[PDB]
């Protein structure tokens, strides 16, 4: 069983890739080829983004996938098979690349922004969520202190409505 | 590092003209044609309610635009065109 | 918005992502309410009877590109997801013949009258191109349906295809 | 279906000659007719009848023969109106 | 030159989802080809559904068809032969005669669907036809250039009047008649065959003129629909 | 953000609501302020079955004669109406 089901939407392919590669070690090995592939796609503005279009022919889709894999052994591992399978199954998997990254984080990294009344963009890369959270929050407050602005606490709206409606 | 450049230029090439010099921005690639409908990927400059030359000798109207394909109703018989033209 | 999403719809789910050895055997992905999807049978003849490994047969009316769907001609409680499916490779065959009469058999040919087995000229395909235009002459032989008005006003002849519509 | 509707159109269009026969641009009218939902035979008949009364002088006819598919139909009344303007 | 062929991938209902290869996507209404153990399977492409897969609802039985069987396009629309050679024959929707009457080779086997007459090719006239029945001889003339309709439910047998009209007209016709059996009951088909042959209209060995083509009513609906298309094509020729 | 109330939809209910017009879940809308509660139960309660149910042994009055002595409206009489 994967760390948590990603609720589909072309995330089925990524979920299956995570499960199969988790049968093997294929964890950093899987994510590394994916990161290289995504970087390569970004490295070609066109022919790698316009290549992520439905209009690409089946021969064209297989050829584009093969050419992307042609960047030496940057397409090493089961990611090659997944890319070829998608080449006819579903053309667009950049979101599937991000989902593979999400699965990798779920396997190893975890963590997401808390929120509540803060709009901060931090991270807490630790399995536990009962110790490091406070340290991460205080650090991100005392270091950087970027645009975490929710404008104001919604309780202002709460009190305003509460008083304004008897 | 010539391999990445060669691969990218080959990928951009061998594509006839769909992504070679056109990118389907001014002309269009017809994904499918139901009856007079023409779900077309391309024509990234055609406005709503557009008369378009479907390159099959039959004109038609682009009377709706969507996320990734434009449904350009055709002003002629369906067989008169073909998918992918 | 740089583009659209990753996709719109799907057809297949399971994650082997490898070669297809399910050309004679099937995978029952979706099964229920008397209709079952099957993964496998790459080139099955349409409307071929197919046997589910649990013990219930089936005919395959649906052969959609991804998975082919086969009707589960029985109580569906025996079928289950992932159960093997064997291709019987034939159109619906029922042993029917001159020895069939005088009993009650299931429309699957099996004699269920309870008064013993059935011996018949053999099993014949139940859906075949009917006698067309050539080997037939106009129905000349009468059929006397006994009821006076039936025989008289609206006589249904011998060999014909009359119908008795009614409430 | 046609409770004289086609006939009424023929009559009104033809009677226009009563006034267009003169020369007064104040009252002379350049009438036209759109052809939504008509078999080509009906249009042929109306054209023949008009020419018989010598109405090929100042009348026009937007032609959507029932052969034409949905695009020609759903744009023919509007294009006719544009000619009218 | 190159024989375009594809892989017929999915069979749903009576429709076969004929995928195709690059540039091999057959056009809609084009004549496909499917060779089967039972013989020829006739499928007419439908809405070309993208993904290089053009839909098709076949003109023959959906049974026995095996997924992935190759289907090669005929290069144009569905076709039946055209010419006086068709006379005296029962042309099927696929075009393979069902009477076992052997191939009557004609000049051309034109595609079923085509253009109609232009308004510069559509004329009109007031002519009356000798229908030989005093009912249609007096109370309603039949038009030599205009449609002549009819009505009446089962048991009124208007087809009998049709055959009679064909015979009487042909008896004084400088041009050959034509028919189109849009989905008639098969027994009525054979009876029509016998009455047309023995009346002298369908001269089995002579030079007949009333080429009866029947849709046969016992097929998946596509053949039945396109049968009238075939008959109109024949009369147009 | 979507905040989970953590409770099935429950309505402010109790004898105090007397004379007060309450919104969907029970938000007062006339402008009379709070109305006390004798329980806030979920909006979809399971009705009493057979044993906890009983006959219509106590009658009542529909007020308007309104064909009411003709067809009564008794204890639990689930009557219906219709009109344009």
JSON list of N, CA, C and O in Angstrom, two decimals, chain F residues 62-79:
[
{"chain": "F", "resi": 62, "resn": "UNK", "atom": "N", "xyz": [-58.88, 20.50, 13.28]},
{"chain": "F", "resi": 62, "resn": "UNK", "atom": "CA", "xyz": [-58.20, 21.25, 12.23]},
{"chain": "F", "resi": 62, "resn": "UNK", "atom": "C", "xyz": [-58.55, 22.73, 12.29]},
{"chain": "F", "resi": 62, "resn": "UNK", "atom": "O", "xyz": [-58.02, 23.52, 11.50]},
{"chain": "F", "resi": 63, "resn": "UNK", "atom": "N", "xyz": [-59.43, 23.12, 13.21]},
{"chain": "F", "resi": 63, "resn": "UNK", "atom": "CA", "xyz": [-59.80, 24.51, 13.34]},
{"chain": "F", "resi": 63, "resn": "UNK", "atom": "C", "xyz": [-60.90, 24.92, 12.38]},
{"chain": "F", "resi": 63, "resn": "UNK", "atom": "O", "xyz": [-62.07, 24.96, 12.76]},
{"chain": "F", "resi": 64, "resn": "UNK", "atom": "N", "xyz": [-60.54, 25.21, 11.13]},
{"chain": "F", "resi": 64, "resn": "UNK", "atom": "CA", "xyz": [-61.58, 25.46, 10.14]},
{"chain": "F", "resi": 64, "resn": "UNK", "atom": "C", "xyz": [-62.35, 24.17, 9.91]},
{"chain": "F", "resi": 64, "resn": "UNK", "atom": "O", "xyz": [-61.75, 23.10, 9.81]},
{"chain": "F", "resi": 65, "resn": "UNK", "atom": "N", "xyz": [-63.69, 24.26, 9.88]},
{"chain": "F", "resi": 65, "resn": "UNK", "atom": "CA", "xyz": [-64.51, 23.08, 9.61]},
{"chain": "F", "resi": 65, "resn": "UNK", "atom": "C", "xyz": [-64.02, 22.38, 8.35]},
{"chain": "F", "resi": 65, "resn": "UNK", "atom": "O", "xyz": [-63.97, 21.14, 8.30]},
{"chain": "F", "resi": 66, "resn": "UNK", "atom": "N", "xyz": [-63.74, 23.16, 7.31]},
{"chain": "F", "resi": 66, "resn": "UNK", "atom": "CA", "xyz": [-62.81, 22.81, 6.24]},
{"chain": "F", "resi": 66, "resn": "UNK", "atom": "C", "xyz": [-62.83, 21.34, 5.88]},
{"chain": "F", "resi": 66, "resn": "UNK", "atom": "O", "xyz": [-61.78, 20.73, 5.67]},
{"chain": "F", "resi": 67, "resn": "UNK", "atom": "N", "xyz": [-64.03, 20.75, 5.83]},
{"chain": "F", "resi": 67, "resn": "UNK", "atom": "CA", "xyz": [-64.20, 19.32, 5.60]},
{"chain": "F", "resi": 67, "resn": "UNK", "atom": "C", "xyz": [-63.38, 18.55, 6.62]},
{"chain": "F", "resi": 67, "resn": "UNK", "atom": "O", "xyz": [-62.88, 17.46, 6.33]},
{"chain": "F", "resi": 68, "resn": "UNK", "atom": "N", "xyz": [-63.23, 19.10, 7.82]},
{"chain": "F", "resi": 68, "resn": "UNK", "atom": "CA", "xyz": [-62.37, 18.48, 8.82]},
{"chain": "F", "resi": 68, "resn": "UNK", "atom": "C", "xyz": [-63.10, 17.46, 9.67]},
{"chain": "F", "resi": 68, "resn": "UNK", "atom": "O", "xyz": [-62.54, 16.40, 9.97]},
{"chain": "F", "resi": 69, "resn": "UNK", "atom": "N", "xyz": [-64.33, 17.75, 10.08]},
{"chain": "F", "resi": 69, "resn": "UNK", "atom": "CA", "xyz": [-65.14, 16.71, 10.71]},
{"chain": "F", "resi": 69, "resn": "UNK", "atom": "C", "xyz": [-65.40, 15.58, 9.74]},
{"chain": "F", "resi": 69, "resn": "UNK", "atom": "O", "xyz": [-65.52, 14.42, 10.15]},
{"chain": "F", "resi": 70, "resn": "UNK", "atom": "N", "xyz": [-65.50, 15.91, 8.45]},
{"chain": "F", "resi": 70, "resn": "UNK", "atom": "CA", "xyz": [-65.59, 14.88, 7.42]},
{"chain": "F", "resi": 70, "resn": "UNK", "atom": "C", "xyz": [-64.36, 13.98, 7.42]},
{"chain": "F", "resi": 70, "resn": "UNK", "atom": "O", "xyz": [-64.46, 12.78, 7.69]},
{"chain": "F", "resi": 71, "resn": "UNK", "atom": "N", "xyz": [-63.19, 14.54, 7.11]},
{"chain": "F", "resi": 71, "resn": "UNK", "atom": "CA", "xyz": [-61.93, 13.82, 7.15]},
{"chain": "F", "resi": 71, "resn": "UNK", "atom": "C", "xyz": [-61.07, 14.42, 8.25]},
{"chain": "F", "resi": 71, "resn": "UNK", "atom": "O", "xyz": [-60.53, 15.52, 8.09]},
{"chain": "F", "resi": 72, "resn": "UNK", "atom": "N", "xyz": [-60.93, 13.74, 9.38]},
{"chain": "F", "resi": 72, "resn": "UNK", "atom": "CA", "xyz": [-60.21, 14.35, 10.51]},
{"chain": "F", "resi": 72, "resn": "UNK", "atom": "C", "xyz": [-58.73, 14.55, 10.23]},
{"chain": "F", "resi": 72, "resn": "UNK", "atom": "O", "xyz": [-58.23, 14.28, 9.14]},
{"chain": "F", "resi": 73, "resn": "UNK", "atom": "N", "xyz": [-58.04, 15.05, 11.25]},
{"chain": "F", "resi": 73, "resn": "UNK", "atom": "CA", "xyz": [-56.58, 15.13, 11.27]},
{"chain": "F", "resi": 73, "resn": "UNK", "atom": "C", "xyz": [-56.11, 14.83, 12.68]},
{"chain": "F", "resi": 73, "resn": "UNK", "atom": "O", "xyz": [-56.00, 15.73, 13.52]},
{"chain": "F", "resi": 74, "resn": "UNK", "atom": "N", "xyz": [-55.79, 13.57, 12.94]},
{"chain": "F", "resi": 74, "resn": "UNK", "atom": "CA", "xyz": [-55.60, 13.09, 14.29]},
{"chain": "F", "resi": 74, "resn": "UNK", "atom": "C", "xyz": [-54.15, 13.06, 14.69]},
{"chain": "F", "resi": 74, "resn": "UNK", "atom": "O", "xyz": [-53.29, 13.67, 14.06]},
{"chain": "F", "resi": 75, "resn": "UNK", "atom": "N", "xyz": [-53.88, 12.34, 15.78]},
{"chain": "F", "resi": 75, "resn": "UNK", "atom": "CA", "xyz": [-52.53, 12.23, 16.32]},
{"chain": "F", "resi": 75, "resn": "UNK", "atom": "C", "xyz": [-51.59, 11.57, 15.32]},
{"chain": "F", "resi": 75, "resn": "UNK", "atom": "O", "xyz": [-51.64, 10.35, 15.12]},
{"chain": "F", "resi": 76, "resn": "UNK", "atom": "N", "xyz": [-50.73, 12.37, 14.70]},
{"chain": "F", "resi": 76, "resn": "UNK", "atom": "CA", "xyz": [-49.79, 11.85, 13.73]},
{"chain": "F", "resi": 76, "resn": "UNK", "atom": "C", "xyz": [-50.35, 11.64, 12.35]},
{"chain": "F", "resi": 76, "resn": "UNK", "atom": "O", "xyz": [-49.71, 10.96, 11.54]},
{"chain": "F", "resi": 77, "resn": "UNK", "atom": "N", "xyz": [-51.51, 12.20, 12.04]},
{"chain": "F", "resi": 77, "resn": "UNK", "atom": "CA", "xyz": [-52.13, 12.00, 10.75]},
{"chain": "F", "resi": 77, "resn": "UNK", "atom": "C", "xyz": [-51.36, 12.78, 9.70]},
{"chain": "F", "resi": 77, "resn": "UNK", "atom": "O", "xyz": [-51.52, 13.99, 9.57]},
{"chain": "F", "resi": 78, "resn": "UNK", "atom": "N", "xyz": [-50.53, 12.07, 8.95]},
{"chain": "F", "resi": 78, "resn": "UNK", "atom": "CA", "xyz": [-49.68, 12.69, 7.94]},
{"chain": "F", "resi": 78, "resn": "UNK", "atom": "C", "xyz": [-50.56, 13.03, 6.75]},
{"chain": "F", "resi": 78, "resn": "UNK", "atom": "O", "xyz": [-50.64, 12.26, 5.79]},
{"chain": "F", "resi": 79, "resn": "UNK", "atom": "N", "xyz": [-51.23, 14.17, 6.82]},
{"chain": "F", "resi": 79, "resn": "UNK", "atom": "CA", "xyz": [-52.12, 14.63, 5.76]},
{"chain": "F", "resi": 79, "resn": "UNK", "atom": "C", "xyz": [-51.33, 15.44, 4.75]},
{"chain": "F", "resi": 79, "resn": "UNK", "atom": "O", "xyz": [-50.30, 16.03, 5.09]}
]
